[PDB]
């Protein structure tokens, strides 16, 4: 449906931040990973205009730049099944980012963001943004479990060393 | 009820209002992320520093460009530096006063369409304009004719233009300008030992170049006065306290200008694609041209560049008649202030983008408004 | 309602409540068993003193310190001063306060993951955190910026700090502390013949240490008034009743802060690892990194500390630019004082581990809260 | 009558004759003075051990590097070095062979200006000369075309090249190397507790770093098998004979190589500044960097590192057209034996920079010898 549309090669390198800045506890890892899928979705203008202002079109109403619009974007995200057509229109986004040509590279990054600044801390209680978008670039969707896992204790020796 | 403008600087905002002489407010383009933990509970807040505040705070940020080369590349950070200019800066409304934004020749269509689609459908101004930038530096001139050096932070290039018309195949355009200047001198402090890796020095790389480069009158004889390094060194503070000190690099980094091999580009330098231009041109206007050569931007702010370029294009041109160096004083801020002349004036109201004529044309209309 | 922060001091276990301007208990860390035969019949049990009473008791028993190094190392004893915390001397129902440990950077994980686990499986406290040592002690300061020379009894350590910002990559950390010193000044005073062995010694060695060692101002020049041995002496009765006296160790126990050689470990002074943190920091931060140095500590309660680094941070950076050593009168409980104030922060109360989470997470939750 | 070729390595002196295969001697580039008393009567003379008898001696020595991150830092210990290469373990006069000194790109001209004159003026040799690192790797390769990940102990740099002809503009360097890798696996080993402190600590941490670490070629991924840790872990016997283990600090300390923002270090990684080297090249080279690229030097002898960069520039590039990585089995040795070529070559022998055309010309001919 969005056929002839097309992207530039990493365009969101920039946007990425540092491991360092997503290990703050003041870092709301929402509005900076949806800023990442923002930037890394900027269409290429080699795309025709009647395809690119429809997607862009739908952009605006899905992934807002405004942190008031994003934060307002949640609101519905409680009720979905009570907003169908903005909740219908998702699924198109999430088939262009499954078709996505840097999506290994996306997805490696995109469950970076989920470690490092916890932004799955929900784990099935996410809303439907956040849901999706990983669930567009994770087939199988198995992101349910195994952040949460970092081998605590174990000592298969001696005691401390100096 | 006044219009704004403001000029999308590739290295430094610069915006004001109509009729104004000075621009209200000059801040560079810079966004910037914070890079690290931010273990304070109350101070972690405002997630993206731009502007003055991202100047200041230079030490824990990320410090990035929305626009290289000329060309808006980071839409999302375009739209939070004109957020910062209208309400942060200005403080006023955007929906009251007509704007006027500035760009480039030659620059992609799409950094065109997309900046007055991203003018309208977010910031709702009534009406728009984008002028090409060296055609409002003769508006600072008060002259109708002769070429324009505007050789900016992103990109320096020619607009030829006689007294009303311009030539539009003569528009010549180089890439190479001050993040170019700025880029070659970090490459140059090395050999010295001064090692400014990141973005923060890369800042203060520029704040070494503005204070103390010059250009050369002869580049070889006066590169021969640093073999006697006697009296050319002057030293500079950093922000640590540590002092550095720089000899030869301090006029070797301008002449980028005049020999791009310095950078490798294969490319005339600013003299040469000065005369380049002017022979494009048709033979009447040359005699002309040759009179009226404007300095324009902040780049050609450096000290003896009107001194070199009046030899340089003289050893290109015939030598028989004369030439001419429009160097103002002003030459930083002649793209606004000419910006600032145009949209007062009288017979100007009806050469806006209005939103009435916007809705049934879409982002094409500008293409239909002065190229 | 209200929360505990309770410091775990490698020495002394400094404790209260949230919004208290003075911890409510301090007593040292120790616990200790006897050693003797016991042969009354009453006065026998209470096979384990810990604490004040152990304190008073010291000559019976085998002091012996849960903490060595800023690490936990004996389980078993940390439950029993924990324990004596909030019932003995606190008198409070750890399952109904949120408490707010306290550790050092660069400590072991399985200090931090054990002592979660030994909260929440033992005490049943309702939500807990742990805080960096010298990132309480900025909040202390009431200032927001600057690195802090946050030496204990069992670690000394550097936590360089922009305005919210952590660096994480440029946290030093050094062992030498306040029983390094006592240790050292055990086998100083051999040499006046002055020879203090055991446990309880020990403790008596430090009751010399902080009446009478001060740091000197140069070093090599006020050891050569100790050459001309006129009015340095100062003497200490110890409990038994027999004095002692003391002249250059009086002094030179302290420079093991300096020079670490003197108890043989092959580093940097705290001098110097201050500066060695600041030059690790990025070029902008460390003009404002001199101008906030926060002594912290009740290692640097020693007479003289300030204007020492003040005079030795001076030899090493660049003169061109002022230093300054914040200094407080509270420095021995600035950990303390800052962590009561972050506790009681209106923006906090989202900040804690809740056992509600916990029970889903295991212990290396904390690993996900402020690493 | 034969030359000598001496890659003066950042952490390994690497020497021998020109046309041999092998380099001659290996030798860690460490001098140490002793720090400790002496009171043997007959041990105590040579009081600075270099080299390998610095190597064995460890535990009794300030081990220094005379060189980091490229830049040579004390002349006084490096003339000490090279006295140890050519009568302590090559046993020949350095006043009858030639020598051909090795160097890294865009280090500070007196890198380069003293090292020539320690050369002349101490040495005597007759002819030396400096090779950029990377451009001798080609001649290791055999072929005259290709990018060079040359990482080594102090600096990683890359040189594209193309048939004959170099790209001066487009070498990039990075100073994160194998101390950098170094003194983050000193980090990390801290959260397992495992506290290695100083210099004879900060060796026996790159004994663990060689033998052990390998890099992922699927960081996140790889990662979460160490959530599972089953087969993860080795273990290492330390010198005194207690034993460590290591789960996931193993791969996670080379990948400093490419996310720099480990340590801080606000960069992009060798991945990538691979990458936007070849787009700093003109366009018709970029087909054949893509099908040549040189890892070179002992940082990359990695396991895996090979199989990750080719899959990471293929995320990068355009993937219509192939990648190839030209990964030897001796880049450990690739600088050396380039440069135990390149002097044998019968076309060289004018190359030189000969003591007869020093002598009027000074310390700055070799700034007219290859830049
Ligand atoms: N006084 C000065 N001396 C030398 N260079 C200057 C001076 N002022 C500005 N510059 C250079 O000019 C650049 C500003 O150009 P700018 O006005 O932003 O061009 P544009 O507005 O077209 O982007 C700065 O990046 C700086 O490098
Ligand atoms: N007034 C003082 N003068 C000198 N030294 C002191 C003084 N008070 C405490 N100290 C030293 O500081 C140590 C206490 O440090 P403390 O604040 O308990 O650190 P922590 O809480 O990390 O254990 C004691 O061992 C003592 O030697
Ligand atoms: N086989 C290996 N496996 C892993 N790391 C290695 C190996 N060999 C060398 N290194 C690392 O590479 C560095 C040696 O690089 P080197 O070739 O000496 O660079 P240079 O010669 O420019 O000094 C050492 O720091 C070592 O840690
Ligand atoms: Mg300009
Ligand atoms: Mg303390
Ligand atoms: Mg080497």
Redesign the pocket.
Known sequence: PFSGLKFKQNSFLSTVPSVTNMHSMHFDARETFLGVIRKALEPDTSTPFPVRRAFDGLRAEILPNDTIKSAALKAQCSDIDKHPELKAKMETLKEVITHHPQKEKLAEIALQFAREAGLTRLKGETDYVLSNVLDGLIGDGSWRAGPAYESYLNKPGVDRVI | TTALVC????????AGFAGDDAPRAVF??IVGRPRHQGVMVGMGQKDSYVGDEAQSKRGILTLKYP?EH?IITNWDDMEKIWHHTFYNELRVAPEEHPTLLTE?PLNPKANREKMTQIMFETFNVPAMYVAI?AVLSLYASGRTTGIVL??????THNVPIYEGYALPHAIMRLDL???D??DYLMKILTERGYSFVTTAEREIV?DI???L?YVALDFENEMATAASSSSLEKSYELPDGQVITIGNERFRCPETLFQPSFIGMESAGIHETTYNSIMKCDIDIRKDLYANNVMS???????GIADRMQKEITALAPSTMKIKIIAPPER??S??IGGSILASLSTFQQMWITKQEYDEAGPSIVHRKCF
């Open positions: 000029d999308n600087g590739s290295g430094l905002v610069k560079p383009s626009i000329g480039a930038q505007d050789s900016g932070d992103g990109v300008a001050g993040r200047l700025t520029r170049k503005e204070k480069c931007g902040g780049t050609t702010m450096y000290p930083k801020y793209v606004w």
